[PDB]
Chain A
Amino acid sequence: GSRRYDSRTTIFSPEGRLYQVEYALESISHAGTAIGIMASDGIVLAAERKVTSTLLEQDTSTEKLYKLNDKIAVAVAGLTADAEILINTARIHAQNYLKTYNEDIPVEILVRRLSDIKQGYTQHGGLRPFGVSFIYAGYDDRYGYQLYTSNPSGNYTGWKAISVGANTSAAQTLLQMDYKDDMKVDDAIELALKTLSKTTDSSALTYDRLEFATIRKGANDGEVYQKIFKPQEIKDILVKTGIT
């Protein structure tokens, strides 16, 4: 028979742990670090492109920051390809909600959906889990700004500031040290850059190895705006905060 070659990706360990999930998490832990910090007037998503080259095109890229909705975006940590499969189903779910209720999908409803999908690969199907962790940054008129996180297990939680990928422990301690409830978006933009700058496994923290995005509610308007910083804008924000 075939039973011989079956890994049995969905079984419990004698300790009651999910082998594949724990191993997927171990995988995520070697991926570029991504930070998510929520201010009083916005949210900041920052990510470190793990490994690069001189020829790698930084302009025609967006390997870790993806726009889900017009009010929701995510930072990725893990298999880009796996992430794209989940992201796409997520973009579809948002639109079905919009077509059904003629209202944008509340941030948590979208995060729960995706997590449930992940949870499935955990309880049946005999397929390997998705080696991906997301940091969700979004807004809606019920909870305003929200920050979330979901991992291979299918679990998700909310944060004021959080990180995924490598050196999360060090980064979470630094964040838990200088974060403050009243923080303003630009303060957060700075905390994020500092945190990555102290956990990086690289020499310097140049602009070509970074991705930045902010969901601010531009005072001059009355609605929410998503802005994925361009190579240049990241270069600037890097000089100002004093890292040249």
Chain B
Amino acid sequence: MTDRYSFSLTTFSPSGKLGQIDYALTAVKQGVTSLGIKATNGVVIATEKKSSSPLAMSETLSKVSLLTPDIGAVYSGMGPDYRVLVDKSRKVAHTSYKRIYGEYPPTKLLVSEVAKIMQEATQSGGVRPFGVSLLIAGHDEFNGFSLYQVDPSGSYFPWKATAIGKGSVAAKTFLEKRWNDELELEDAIHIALLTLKESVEGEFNGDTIELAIIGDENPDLLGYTGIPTDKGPRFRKLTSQEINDRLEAL
């Protein structure tokens, strides 16, 4: 018994490549498309809910997850890896920040944490890199709204807008055309719905699509009242309905 695998499974090759990371990126390539757009008063992330049987209930499987009440994430690649990553992320947010400073971490820092976790699976003994790429979107008082992308290597960069997965190239191109530094959240939600239309083959409705945004505070999603400084979460996952209403004016 015992993990006798105490050596690296990702190593440098003569050319200077890191095989396992390259391959992990290839896995992300085959994944369903996901994207994120940054408006001047919000951020929107979205992806496609690729059901694996009409018998499966697509709601019992979210690809868009809330990390903190002001940070959300979405991915492309291996769903399971994403799932455990989201758990570790929600937790590190507490153990490494809320439990010390009494407030949730700022987007860049939480992304930095996530990125660290992924880096270790790139060098630690006996493991393979995570087979996913995430797009994390959040907001924090001193940095406003931001959008980041974290890859299997653990590298991460900020974006105005971008897409990952299957048709990332086509989508990234369609975004450059429609993006400007003056977009309003709703404008981005629209651009998002359009960019995503090209990726989805079959049905394109509020049940085949998953879309959440980071915007204003939702005092109605707080659960209580009595504390002035607590106004609510900026993260909100759109409802099947809220989607279709915009799909019309599409």
Show the binding face of A for B, using Cβ within 8 Å: 1-2, 5-9, 20, 23-30, 53-57, 60-61, 63, 79-82, 84-85, 126-131
Contact = CB atoms under 8 A, between A and B. Distances in A.
B225 interface: no
Contacts, number: 110
B220 to A, nearest CB: 30
26 contacts: A1-B4, A2-B4, A8-B7, A26-B16, A27-B16, A53-B172, A53-B176, A54-B160, A54-B176, A54-B179, A55-B161, A55-B162, A55-B172, A57-B146, A60-B143, A60-B158, A81-B122, A81-B153, A84-B112, A85-B116, A85-B119, A126-B7, A126-B125, A128-B123, A129-B12, A131-B12
Contacts of B101: none
B10 interface: yes
Contacts of B224: none
Q: Which 6 A-B pairs have the closest CB atoms?
A: A81-B154, A26-B16, A126-B7, A57-B158, A23-B12, A27-B16
B158 A56 contact: yes
Contacts of A29: 16
Contacts of A30: 16
Nearest to B143: A60
A27 B18 CA distance: 9
Given A7-B8, A20-B11, A55 B18 contact: no
Interface string B130-170: 00000000000001001100000111111111100000000
B177 to A, nearest CB: 10
Contacts of A84: 112, 115-116, 119, 154
Contacts of B159: 53, 55-57
A5 B4 CA distance: 11
Given A1-B4, A55-B160, A81-B153, A127 B125 contact: yes
